[PDB]
Design a protein around this ligand. Structure first.
Ligand SMILES: [Zn+2]
Lengths: 82, 206, 129, 24, 101, 82, 132
RNA sequence: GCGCAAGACGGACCAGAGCGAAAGCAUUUGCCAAGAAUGUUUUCAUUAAUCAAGAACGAAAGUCGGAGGUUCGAAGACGAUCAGAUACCGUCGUAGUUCCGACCAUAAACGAUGCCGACCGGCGAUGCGGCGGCGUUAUUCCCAUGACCCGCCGGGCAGCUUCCGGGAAACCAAAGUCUUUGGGUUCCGGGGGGAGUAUGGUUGCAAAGCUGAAACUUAAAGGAAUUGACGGAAGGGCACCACC
RNA sequence: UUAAAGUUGCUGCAGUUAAAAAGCUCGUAGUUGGAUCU
C-alpha cells in the first residue's frame, strides 16, 4: 500500500464495501419484475419487500418477507429492471 | 525490462518455470505480497504472476550489474536447498558466497575474522536468512531476496515473487539470475542458449 | 458527537503524513475546510486536491507532498486583535522564518501576514508549519 | 490490618455516643 | 503490580460467575478460576486385572471405567503438584502439557 | 541556508528520501542509496549509466521499500507497464 | 573418563588440515609423522594428538567433517557438484497445468504452448486442519 | 431393600461462550410486557452530547413484622493440639441461610482505566444478522429449508503479532495521535501522618450512611525495574572427611 | 511577599500500578452543538 489510489477504486473494490462506506453511497437493492405462473399480469416488486405481495385480482401470493431479500414462491420468475 | 522486445520473457523460459513449480505458492498470503499474485485456486494455493516474477528478476539483475566490483556483492543461503546454487552463482559472476550458518557480527564487528563490508546483499529466504538481512540495517545495505507468498518484506528492497521452497524452483531461480547478470554485462550472447543447464544448481537428497 | 468538523479534517491530514502516505480522504467536506486547504496549498504544503459530490456533505481527496510538519486547529475561535498577533505567533509558530497562522477576517480566510498587510484582525482558525 | 483498626475506631464512636449525649 | 492479563481467570464480558466447591477443601472458587480435571480411570488397576478375568463368567467381558470431574482451588492444585510455577515467559504458554504423546 | 548577501551558510545539504521526502540524517544507518543500471534499446547490454534512488530507514522498516522502489522504477520507464 | 581437550583436538585438527597427504589410518605411522613436523613436548602429549588423528581420519572416509578443510576434498566435492544428467529434469514432453494457471498463461499471451495439459481440479474445498 | 414427607438446590453438558445500565442471569412448558444487532430506494427532519438540583435500581451482611424451618452455620457449650489457644482440627448448635411486606445504600461494587466523536498496522478464530459460491448430508427426486464446506459486509466478547507511537518502567493498538502542547463535556488529586477522627448539619427503628476540620507531628513515605541474601516454594547434580 | 512553582496548570499539570473516575443509569439549570444560500 502507502500509495493506494483513493480517487479511482476498481469496481471489484467498491462492490465489496459497505454501502455507506463507498466513495459515493449506493443501495444494494433493486426493483424486480415478477410474473405469476397462472396469471398474466406483470408486477413490480421490491427486492427487500416487507409486505406479502399478491396479485390484485388473480389472488396469488407473489412473495413472502424474510430477514433479507423477500422470498419468491415457486413457479414465479423475475428479472431486474434496468 | 523497459518494455523492450529483447528483454521479454520467452516460451522456453515459461516452460522452465512451469516444470519447476515456480508459479505455485503457499496457503497463506502476506499483505505486502498481494500485488504479485494472480488468483487463489481451490485447495487453497495462491498462484504467482510469472510476468511480475520476470520484471522483478530483471530489476534485481540490473541492480547487481550496477555494482562495479563483482566481489562486493554477497550471496547468502542458510538452507541446504540453496547452498549449491549460491556457490555456483558466485563462481560464474564472481560474487562472495555464504552457505551455512551466518555468524552474528559479520557486518558490524570490525575485529572479527570473517569481517566483510558488502555493497549489495542477495539472500535466498527472508524468513530463514533473517539475521544477515537485519544486520544489514546497521551498515546501509540494499537487499534483494527471493520471496514466497508468506514472506515478510522488512529490510527487503527488491523482492522476487517465486516459490522459494522447492529445490528445483530455487535452483532455477538462482540460475536465471546469473544468466541475466552475465547477459546484461555482455559476456554471454543473447541468441545462443546458455550451455550451462539448471541441473548444476539443484539440491540432491542423499 | 461530531463538533468542529475542521478539527477532524486537520487531524486526518496530520495523521496520514506521519505514515508517509500520498493521499488522504477527508469527510465531511465544508467550505471552511476548502478555504483552509487552499491557504495551505498556495504556500506549497499540500498540492492539488479534489472534491467528491454525494448530494450530501461531500468529501475531499488531498495529495500529500511530504512537506508538512504540523497542521492544527485552535478551539475555541478566539478573537485576535492586530496588537495581540505577535504573542500568538510566538506561542504557536516554530520560527520567525516559516510557519503560518490561519485566521478568518471580514476580508476572508487568510494567514497572519496578509492580515497585517490588510490591517485587520479576526478570529483564529488554526496554524500550519 | 486496616480493617481491624476501622472496626476498633467504630466501637469507640459507638461508646462515645452513650458517654457524650445531649443530656450531659 | 499486575501479573496476568486475564487476572488469573476466564471471565470476559460478564459480571458474576457462580461459585463451586473445591474437591479437597470444600472452598468456594469461581468456576472460571478453578482448576478442572476430567479423570477417566479403570475400576480395577493393572494389579488386579489378571485376578478378575480368570474369575469372570463372561468371555470377552470389557471392564467398565470411572468418570470424575475434579475442581481445585489455586492452593490445592499447587500443593498436590497438579500445577507448577514457571518462568515469566513460560507463563504465557497455554498449550496443554504433552501427555498425549 | 543562505543570508541576505546570498552566501550559502549551510555546513552541508542532507539527502532526502525518494519515497517520503524525509531528510536522511547523519546517523541514519538504515538508509540505502541504490543504483539501477541502464541498458541499450537494441543490444540490451549495460550502457554505462544508472539511476539512483535513496530510501530511508523508517520507510524500509515499515516494509514499504519494496513497493516504493518498484513505483520509482515504473515512473522512470525501467519497469514495463504492468 | 577418557575425554580429549581443546589443546590436543585443535592441534590434531590443524595437523590433519595441513598434512592430509602423509597421514593415514595407521597409528604407529601417524605417531612418527607428528614428531617429524610438529614441535611437541613429551610422548604422552605426542600420542594423544596422534591417536585422535588416527581416529579422525576414519571419519573422513565416511565423508566430510565440519571441522577441517582439505583442498583435495574440495576438488572431490567439486567433481561431485559438476554433475548434470544428459536429460534435464525440466524438459518434459507434457506439463500438467491447472485450469486457473492456464488463464494466467492466456493473459501472458502463452496460449499456443503445446506441451501443456489442463487437468481436473479437486472438487471438495477441504484444505484446512480441524480445530481443537 | 420397598415406600412416605419436608425444605433447600438446578450437577455433568458449561466455553477466555451469550444477555443486562450495573448489581446480576442456567430444569420443562405456557402467558405478559421489554430489548440489542442486522435488513430497508419507509417515515419525522436537528428533534443532539455531558450533566448542579432531583430521581429509579443497587451483592453480601444487618433491622422490623408474618410463614417455614432440609442443609450449612456467627454466638455459645464441649473434645483435641499447644509452653499458653479465648484460634486453626473435630461434635453439637442459636441468630441467620429460604419465602412474603417494609427499611438499610454499602464492597478489591475492579478492566483498580467516566461518557460521546474522528484518525492511525497486520493475522487467524468466535457469537449474531445479512449476501454470494463448487461440492457432501436430511437416503435415493421438485424447489425452498436445515447440518457441514469456502469467502464478503456490519455490530459484539476476546486472542496472537509489530521499532505505529507512547511510558519511570511494568506495559498499552490504546494508556497512541502531548513543549510540533486546544474535538465536546462531567467528576475528582496536590509530601507522609493526625484522619475520614472531632464538631455542626442531614437521613435512618437501630446499626450506621452522606458532608467533613484544625491544633500538633514529620524528611521522607511511595511506584517500577536490577544484582544479591533468604524461603517450613518447585526442579536437577556431586562426594566413603555422605549414605548404601 | 514575588520569582523559582508546568508543585493551582487559561497559556500549562495530573487520576491502570506513585495522591486520585461517583456502584450504575435517568434527568432540569449550565457548557457544547453536522451539510447547506454570490
Ligand atoms: Zn482446595
Amino acid at each position: 500500500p502507502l500509495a493506494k489510489d483513493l480517487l479511482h477504486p476498481s469496481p471489484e473494490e467498491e462492490k465489496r464495501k459497505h454501502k455507506k462506506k463507498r466513495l459515493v453511497q449506493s443501495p444494494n437493492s433493486y426493483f424486480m419484475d415478477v410474473k405469476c405462473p397462472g396469471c398474466y399480469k406483470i408486477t413490480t416488486v421490491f427486492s427487500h419487500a416487507q409486505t406479502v405481495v399478491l396479485c390484485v385480482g388473480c389472488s396469488t401470493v407473489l412473495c413472502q418477507p424474510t430477514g433479507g431479500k423477500a422470498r419468491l414462491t415457486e413457479g414465479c420468475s423475475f428479472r431486474r429492471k434496468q | 525490462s523497459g518494455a523492450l522486445d529483447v528483454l521479454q520473457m520467452k516460451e522456453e523460459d515459461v516452460l522452465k518455470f512451469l516444470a519447476a513449480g515456480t508459479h505455485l505458492g503457499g496457503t497463506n498470503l502476506d499483505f505486502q505480497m498481494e500485488q504479485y499474485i494472480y488468483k487463489r485456486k481451490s485447495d487453497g494455493i495462491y498462484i504467482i504472476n510469472l510476468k511480475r516474477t520476470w520484471e522483478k528478476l530483471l530489476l534485481a539483475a540490473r541492480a547487481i550489474v550496477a555494482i562495479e566490483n563483482p566481489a562486493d556483492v554477497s550471496v547468502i543461503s542458510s538452507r541446504n536447498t540453496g547452498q549449491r546454487a549460491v556457490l555456483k552463482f558466485a563462481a560464474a559472476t564472481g560474487a562472495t558466497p555464504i552457505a551455512g550458518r551466518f555468524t552474528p557480527g559479520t557486518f558490524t564487528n570490525q575485529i572479527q575474522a570473517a569481517f566483510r563490508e558488502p555493497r549489495l546483499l542477495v539472500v535466498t529466504d527472508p524468513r530463514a536468512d533473517h539475521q544477515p538481512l537485519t544486520e544489514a540495517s546497521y551498515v546501509n545495505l540494499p537487499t534483494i531476496a527471493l520471496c514466497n507468498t508468506d514472506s515478510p518484506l522488512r529490510y527487503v528492497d527488491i523482492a522476487i515473487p517465486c516459490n522459494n521452497k522447492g529445490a528445483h524452483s530455487v535452483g532455477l531461480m538462482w540460475w536465471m539470475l546469473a544468466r541475466e547478470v552475465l547477459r546484461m554485462r555482455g559476456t554471454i550472447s543473447r541468441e545462443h542458449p546458455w550451455e550451462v543447464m539448471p541441473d548444476l544448481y539443484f539440491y540432491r537428497d542423499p | 458527537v461530531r463538533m468542529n468538523v475542521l478539527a477532524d479534517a486537520l487531524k486526518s491530514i496530520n495523521n496520514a503524513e506521519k505514515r508517509g502516505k500520498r493521499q488522504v480522504l477527508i469527510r465531511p467536506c465544508s467550505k471552511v475546510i476548502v478555504r483552509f486547504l487552499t491557504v495551505m496549498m498556495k504556500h506549497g504544503y499540500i498540492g492539488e486536491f479534489e472534491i467528491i459530490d454525494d448530494h450530501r456533505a461531500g468529501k475531499i481527496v488531498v495529495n500529500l507532498t511530504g512537506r508538512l510538519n504540523k497542521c492544527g486547529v485552535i478551539s475555541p475561535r478566539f478573537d485576535v486583535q492586530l496588537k495581540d498577533l505577535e504573542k500568538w505567533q510566538n506561542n504557536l509558530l516554530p520560527s520567525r522564518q516559516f510557519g503560518f497562522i490561519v485566521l478568518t477576517t471580514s476580508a476572508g480566510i487568510m494567514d497572519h501576514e496578509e492580515a497585517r498587510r490588510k490591517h485587520t484582525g479576526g478570529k483564529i482558525l488554526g496554524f500550519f508549519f | 490490618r486496616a480493617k481491624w483498626r476501622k472496626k476498633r475506631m467504630r466501637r469507640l464512636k459507638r461508646k462515645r455516643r452513650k458517654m457524650r449525649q445531649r443530656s450531659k | 503490580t499486575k501479573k496476568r492479563r486475564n487476572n488469573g481467570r476466564a471471565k470476559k464480558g460478564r459480571g458474576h460467575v457462580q461459585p463451586i466447591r473445591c474437591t479437597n477443601c470444600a472452598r468456594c472458587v469461581p468456576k472460571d478460576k478453578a482448576i478442572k480435571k476430567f479423570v477417566i480411570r479403570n475400576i480395577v488397576e493393572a494389579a488386579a486385572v489378571r485376578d478378575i478375568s480368570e474369575a469372570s463368567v463372561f468371555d470377552a467381558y470389557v471392564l467398565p471405567k470411572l468418570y470424575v470431574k475434579l475442581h481445585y482451588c489455586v492452593s490445592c492444585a499447587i500443593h498436590s503438584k497438579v500445577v507448577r510455577n514457571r518462568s515469566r515467559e513460560a507463563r504465557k504458554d497455554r498449550t496443554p502439557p504433552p501427555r498425549f504423546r | 541556508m543562505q543570508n541576505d548577501a546570498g552566501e550559502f551558510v549551510d555546513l552541508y545539504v542532507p539527502r532526502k528520501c525518494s519515497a517520503s521526502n524525509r531528510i536522511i540524517g547523519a546517523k541514519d544507518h538504515a538508509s540505502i542509496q541504490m543504483n539501477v543500471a541502464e541498458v541499450d534499446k537494441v543490444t540490451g547490454r549495460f550502457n554505462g549509466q544508472f539511476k539512483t534512488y535513496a530510501i530511508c530507514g523508517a520507510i524500509r522498516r515499515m516494509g514499504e521499500s519494496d513497493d516504493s522502489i518498484l513505483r520509482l522504477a515504473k515512473a522512470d520507464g525501467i519497469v514495463s507497464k504492468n | 573418563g577418557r575425554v580429549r581437550t581443546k589443546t590436543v583436538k585443535k592441534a590434531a585438527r590443524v595437523i590433519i588440515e595441513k598434512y592430509y597427504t602423509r597421514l593415514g589410518n595407521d597409528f604407529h605411522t601417524n605417531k612418527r609423522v607428528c614428531e617429524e613436523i610438529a614441535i611437541i613436548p613429551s610422548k604422552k602429549l605426542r600420542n594423544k594428538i596422534a591417536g585422535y588423528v588416527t581416529h579422525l581420519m576414519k571419519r573422513i572416509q565416511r565423508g566430510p567433517v565440519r571441522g577441517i578443510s582439505i583442498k583435495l576434498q574440495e576438488e572431490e566435492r567439486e567433481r561431485r557438484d559438476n554433475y548434470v544428467p544428459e536429460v534435464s529434469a525440466l524438459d518434459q514432453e507434457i506439463i500438467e497445468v491447472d485450469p486457473d494457471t492456464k488463464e494466467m498463461l492466456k493473459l501472458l499471451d502463452f496460449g499456443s504452448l503445446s506441451n501443456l495439459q489442463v487437468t481436473q481440479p479437486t472438487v471438495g474445498m477441504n484444505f484446512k486442519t480441524p480445530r481443537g
